[PDB]
Amino acid sequence: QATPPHRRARSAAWSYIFLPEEAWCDLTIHLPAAVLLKEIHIQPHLASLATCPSSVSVEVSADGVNMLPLSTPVVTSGLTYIKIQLVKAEVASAVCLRLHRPRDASTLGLSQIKLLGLTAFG
Amino acid sequence: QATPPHRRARSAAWSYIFLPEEAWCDLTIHLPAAVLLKEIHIQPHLASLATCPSSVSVEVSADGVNMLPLSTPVVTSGLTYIKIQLVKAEVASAVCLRLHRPRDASTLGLSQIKLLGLTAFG
Numbered sequence: 387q388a389t390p391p392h393r394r395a396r397s398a399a400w401s402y403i404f405l406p407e408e409a410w411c412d413l414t415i416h417l418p419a420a421v422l423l424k425e426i427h428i429q430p431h432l433a434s435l436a437t438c439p440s441s442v443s444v445e446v447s448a449d450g451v452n453m454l455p456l457s458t459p460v461v462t463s464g465l466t467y468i469k470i471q472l473v474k475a476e477v478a479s480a481v482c483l484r485l486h487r488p489r490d491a492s493t494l495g496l497s498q499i500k501l502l503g504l505t506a507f508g
Numbered sequence: 509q510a511t512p513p514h515r516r517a518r519s520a521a522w523s524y525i526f527l528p529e530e531a532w533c534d535l536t537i538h539l540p541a542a543v544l545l546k547e548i549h550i551q552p553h554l555a556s557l558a559t560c561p562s563s564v565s566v567e568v569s570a571d572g573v574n575m576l577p578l579s580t581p582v583v584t585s586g587l588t589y590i591k592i593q594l595v596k597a598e599v600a601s602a603v604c605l606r607l608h609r610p611r612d613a614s615t616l617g618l619s620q621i622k623l624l625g626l627t628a629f630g
Contacts, residue, residue: 433556434555434557435556435557435558435586436557436586436588438586440586461585463583463585463586463611464557464558464560464562464585464586464610464611464612465611465612466558466612466613467612488586489585489586489587490586490587490588490589491588
């Protein structure tokens with residue numbers, strides 16, 4: 387959503403339960419058209435950021451099918467707001483956010499993911 | 509305190525405000541007698557762990573005056589509970605906990621610090 391209501395933050399906007407064997411979970415976001423991606427915004431659960439992801443690895447796909455890793459996973463444990471800027475703006479149509487298991491929590495709690503950038507004529 | 513009331517966690521049990529120039533703040537705990545220290549317990553603000561310390565460096569002093577660093581500072585950002593066990597129990601009379609500035613917070617919030625160990629005849 388463009389702006390969900392963030393005033394009370396009861397439990398979480400979105401929650402994920404982790405199996406003991408797995409540590410990474412991937413959120414694949416498919417855009418209707420390729421955009422000039424510039425910066426990713428990830429907002430964890432602000433009321434209880436124990437469920438904030440330890441590290442996040444972004445992936446971009448210009449054709450929307452070929453997942454390709456972005457950078458090494460930046461550690462966001464203890465961060466109230468995740469801003470992954472790109473020095474080089476990338477033409478991407480699909481974005482895979484692979485979130486790592488938190489340091490001492492088996493659940494992931496997120497509030498809002500933004501996909502900031504431009505278009506070809508915007 | 510042995511057990512402070514942790515049921516609501518309104519603001520914090522203890523809070524620290526960070527100057528822009530400094531990044532480390534030291535809590536020096538002086539015991540009346542030297543004890544066989546075994547493990548440190550640090551509880552951050554459980555309701556809002558944005559103020560949890562990014563990294564903590566412990567220091568022990570057997571004579572109580574000569575501060576001497578323990579290990580490299582363990583990163584506790586995103587940890588609801590900090591348990592620094594010692595494989596070698598150390599005879600310590602003073603314990604200096606040097607807490608680092610959080611990743612995106614200018615305040616530190618702690619709830620309870622425990623100093624676990626034995627005595628000479630206990």
